[PDB]
Design a protein around this ligand. Structure first.
Ligand SMILES: [Mg+2]
Ligand SMILES: [Mg+2]
Ligand SMILES: [Mg+2]
Ligand SMILES: [Mg+2]
Ligand SMILES: [Mg+2]
Ligand SMILES: [Mg+2]
Ligand SMILES: [Mg+2]
Ligand SMILES: [Mg+2]
Ligand SMILES: [Mg+2]
Ligand SMILES: [Mg+2]
Ligand SMILES: [Mg+2]
Ligand SMILES: [Mg+2]
Ligand SMILES: [Mg+2]
Ligand SMILES: [Mg+2]
Ligand SMILES: [Mg+2]
Ligand SMILES: [Mg+2]
Ligand SMILES: [Mg+2]
Ligand SMILES: [Mg+2]
Ligand SMILES: [Mg+2]
Ligand SMILES: [Zn+2]
Lengths: 144, 157, 130, 236
RNA sequence: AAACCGGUUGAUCCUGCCGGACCCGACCGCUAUCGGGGUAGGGCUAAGCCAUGCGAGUCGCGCGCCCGGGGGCGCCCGGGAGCGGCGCACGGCUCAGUAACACGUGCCUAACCUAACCUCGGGAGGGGGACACCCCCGGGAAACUGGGGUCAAUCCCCCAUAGGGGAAGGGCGCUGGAAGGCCCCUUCCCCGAAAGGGCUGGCGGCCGAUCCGCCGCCAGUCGCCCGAGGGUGGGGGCACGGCCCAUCAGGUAGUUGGCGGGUUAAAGGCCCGCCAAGCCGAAGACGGGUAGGGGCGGUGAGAGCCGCGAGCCCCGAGAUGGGCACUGAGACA
């Protein structure tokens, strides 16, 4: 169901598991995240399945990985209090979907993307760890 | 969940301590010279005076760039109403503006100061009964704050 | 159908397990559901067309006798007959009461097939031979 | 369906407080509610030909008003960007164009360019027969063969013949053309397209327009190409 | 106007409370001439109980019938009881429930439906039926309602074709950030349209003053069906923001997730079969209390405090308490 790889593939590659099924690393529309270093066959996977994500991305840290194909991550931000003119650090725990091709541990910073709802509390999925990010810039064409 | 309703516009000129002797003496003089009806009219004049001064205070605190578009038009509008005399004074000169300059612009005062009536209370009675034509139209409100250009059009019946 | 007996609205339970109040007193008709309509193994095929939300229509198989079995190894479609329901992995009580659901095995005339459609929603039994 | 006067669009040329508590609501025509004005409002407010709503309905009920070559007898018909409004018994023609003050204005136009309408391609769909369907900024559609519809990408402006149901001229969206901003704060501005920051979503790309040398920026969604240095049809 | 003044001492300097002076909101007392502007008035009190009246209709250019006046070509006009279409889910009221995806801001539906309307492409062939008003009788206090006869439709139904849905295999192609989508090809199963109807004018034909029509065609106009998109309305999802109490510390067991299914217009423990032990909590769970949320409003020189966060606008919920359905695009009205 999950076959690891000695090297990472690219978007559009087709890799066949020991079962002989061919899985193509789809293009999830986010060009600054690398595909996982292993392949799964889950139809709810965004890399190797039919799952479609939205363009909302968040960077969180894994807290509890003891649910099946899911994890408990923490989301952090800073809130301004106008009366005191100071900040407060707020955090919220979210439930997210962890695909089989992506392995996570507590304390690790991952990337999540909003999808359609998958369970009572899961609507976000781990797109990939932070280290699979890549620097990206837009295009700036100008007529002199 | 709050619905806006109008508030008194003479509150800005109202003193929060009415029971001062020197305060009572100065205000009683002002009502006598200009023939006002009650202290509400006198406070309403001061509320106008506080607007002219507080506005000039804020324009001073604005930056030179910000002050520039509003500086000359503010003084020009003050000149046309007849409150000030020079529309080209420094902006801090407006800060010392005095409430009597607003009371002179009252239509009742202008009828008396133009020699069109026997007394200031008679000139109030003239406007009230409708014998004072401002550019050909009857203006019956004695507290009308006449601007500069309309002042020369004041006639009697 | 949109029946309040099969209401598909949200629970009254938080993820923490605590209870929460009811924002709305009544059950909305838009969030209503319906009873199951999966067909039963019968001696003839009976189809019922149902009017649904927005004036649309859904084909319901009340009673199923034939299956459009398809042979992958031959690429032919046969409208074979159904003899018994071998087993229903989602719930054995479907096979125990002769009710056909998607993913169920059927011992058809040509052999065995796995039901590949939702017979309460599609209205036909598309089957693939094993 | 009602429309409270408070909920009316902000740019409409009507007083906000004084009047009734109601406003005429457009009847889901070929525009958007936020970006369209009903016909009865135009006849009563923008042209001032009717003093009441009944008088405006009477004028419209006679078919005196033609909108893009079709006589509209609905007083709640929506009018919007680049629409051609023609008054039959007087012979005057207007093209509702993006205005720097009124946000949308009735500008008189010559009778020659009355049948022409510049339409911005909002998207294409593949239809039966393999043909291509084009969707324009006012919801209008046009089905074309696959090869001809391949070369017309989204945001390209095409000058459409209302009289022949055809495409007179296709204006691709490339850097260096004349564009008019059709929505947002910078409405009414016409300038050269000379700068783009292509974002991940193309509709949200940052675009810059120049008019020697006032430079305004918007998103790519909010600009229509009106051609090269000469605008093809009178808009200003 | 960025303000103080009175009072604990025999006297004094403090601390520290309480009072005075001001604005606004509710109720009340005494008094009360006129006008202008304003979205003021059983909200702050019982979402307590109610006599009476009024509060959603319209269309004869969908349909037949009846009545009265007029006229000959083929009818004109007025009226009646109805069928039928569309609307009555908008609008109006109130503040019990709600600490919640209710509300606000910013985003999604690639997981969805949408009558009326707009645009592009295509279509309108064949054949049947019934029920009102009415007529002959009623029944019943009334509400309501029965039988026979009888004229129609844009009323209802069938047949054909278009089209549509599912399952499966392929593809150049389209959209789009990204295809479980669209388009094309192949196989099977299954469902399955339409009102060429009204009006106007022209032509011709059938027919007859006991008829005042019917038929074919043409044009104009208002309509009907299908495919695609828009529009509008709606269902659903997400991130974050906004009360008090620890004299409330552990709570949860469909509870948290996985897999397979059902149902839905549509994703989802929404529901079901199996598997696991997970889920929340002192960064305050759980429990209790209070409260419709916002735009906003009062006050202060301001920071801020308060809600008079009643009246006006937007969203929500409700219709004596609690439930459940019909019709319909949309209601559980
Ligand atoms: Mg949910
Ligand atoms: Mg102070
Ligand atoms: Mg003493
Ligand atoms: Mg005190
Ligand atoms: Mg009450
Ligand atoms: Mg008609
Ligand atoms: Mg009638
Ligand atoms: Mg009716
Ligand atoms: Mg309402
Ligand atoms: Mg009968
Ligand atoms: Mg019909
Ligand atoms: Mg399709
Ligand atoms: Mg048929
Ligand atoms: Mg018929
Ligand atoms: Mg499902
Ligand atoms: Mg539950
Ligand atoms: Mg009221
Ligand atoms: Mg009840
Ligand atoms: Mg009811
Ligand atoms: Zn995967």
């Amino acid at each position: 169901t999950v076959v690891k790889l000695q090297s990472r593939p690219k978007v559009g590659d087709v890799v066949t598991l020991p079962d002989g099924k061919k899985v193509e690393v789809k293009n999830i529309g986010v060009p600054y995240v690398l595909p996982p270093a292993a392949v799964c066959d889950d139809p709810l996977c965004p890399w190797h399945g039919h799952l479609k994500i939205r363009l909302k991305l968040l960077e969180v840290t894994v807290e509890k990985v003891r649910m099946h194909k899911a994890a408990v991550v923490t989301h952090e931000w800073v809130h301004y209090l106008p009366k005191y003119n100071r900040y407060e650090r707020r955090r919220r725990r979210m439930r997210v979907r962890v695909p089989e091709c992506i392995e996570v541990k507590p304390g690790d910073k991952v990337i999540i993307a909003e999808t359609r709802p998958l369970s009572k509390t899961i609507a976000w999925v781990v797109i990939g760890k932070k280290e699979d990010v890549v620097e990206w810039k837009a295009k700036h064409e100008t007529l002199p | 969940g709050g619905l806006k309703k109008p508030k008194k516009k003479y509150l800005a000129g109202k003193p929060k301590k009415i029971w001062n002797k020197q305060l009572l003496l100065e205000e009683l003089q002002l009502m006598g010279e200009y023939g006002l009806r009650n202290k509400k009219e006198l406070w309403l004049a001061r509320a106008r005076l506080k607007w002219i001064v507080r506005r000039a205070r804020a324009l001073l605190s604005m930056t030179a760039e910000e002050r520039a578009p509003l500086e000359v038009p503010f003084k020009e509008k003050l000149y046309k109403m007849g409150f000030i005399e020079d529309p080209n004074v420094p902006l801090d000169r407006i800060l010392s503006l005095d409430v009597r300059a607003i009371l002179e612009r009252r239509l009742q005062t202008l009828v008396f100061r133009m020699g069109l009536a026997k007394s200031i209370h008679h000139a109030r009675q003239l406007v009230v009964h409708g014998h004072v034509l401002v550019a050909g139209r009857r203006v019956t409100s004695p507290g009308f704050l006449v601007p500069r250009e309309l002042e020369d059009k004041i006639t009697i019946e | 159908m949109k029946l309040g007996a099969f209401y598909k609205g949200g629970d009254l339970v938080k993820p923490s397990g605590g209870k929460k109040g009811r924002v709305r007193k009544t059950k909305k008709k838009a969030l209503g559901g319906g009873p199951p309509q999966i067909p039963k193994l019968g001696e003839e095929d009976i189809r019922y067309v149902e009017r649904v939300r927005g004036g649309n229509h859904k084909v319901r198989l009340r009673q199923a006798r034939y299956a459009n079995v398809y042979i992958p190894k031959e690429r032919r479609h046969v409208k074979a007959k159904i003899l018994s329901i071998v087993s229903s992995p989602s719930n054995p009580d479907y096979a125990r009461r002769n009710y056909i659901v998607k993913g169920a095995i059927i011992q058809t005339e040509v052999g065995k097939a796995v039901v590949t459609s939702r017979p309460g929603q599609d209205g036909v039994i598309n089957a693939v031979l094993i | 369906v009602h429309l409270r006067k408070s909920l009316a669009p902000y740019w409409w040329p009507i007083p906000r407080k004084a009047g009734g508590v109601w406003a005429v609501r457009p009847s889901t025509g070929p525009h958007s509610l936020e970006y369209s004005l009903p016909l009865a409002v135009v006849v009563r407010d923008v042209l001032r030909y009717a003093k009441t709503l009944r008088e405006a309905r009477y004028i419209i009920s006679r078919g005196y008003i033609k909108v893009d070559g079709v006589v509209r007898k609905d007083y709640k018909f929506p009018i919007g960007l680049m629409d051609v409004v023609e008054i039959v018994p007087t012979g005057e023609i207007y093209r509702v164009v993006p205005d720097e003050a009124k946000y949308y204005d009735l500008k008189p136009i010559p009778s020659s360019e009355a049948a022409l309408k510049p339409l911005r391609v909002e998207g294409k769909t593949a239809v039966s027969g393999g043909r291509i369907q084009l969707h324009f900024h006012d919801g209008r559609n046009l089905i074309l063969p696959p090869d001809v519809g391949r070369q017309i990408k989204t945001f390209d402006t095409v000058v459409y013949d209302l009289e022949n149901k055809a495409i007179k001229t296709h204006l691709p969206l490339r850097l260096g053309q004349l564009a008019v901003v059709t929505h947002g704060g910078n409405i009414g501005f016409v300038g050269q397209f000379f700068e783009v920051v292509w974002t991940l979503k193309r509709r949200q790309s940052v675009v810059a327009l120049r008019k020697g040398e006032e430079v305004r920026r918007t998103i790519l969604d909010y600009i229509m190409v009106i051609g090269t240095e000469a605008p093809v049809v009178k808009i200003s």
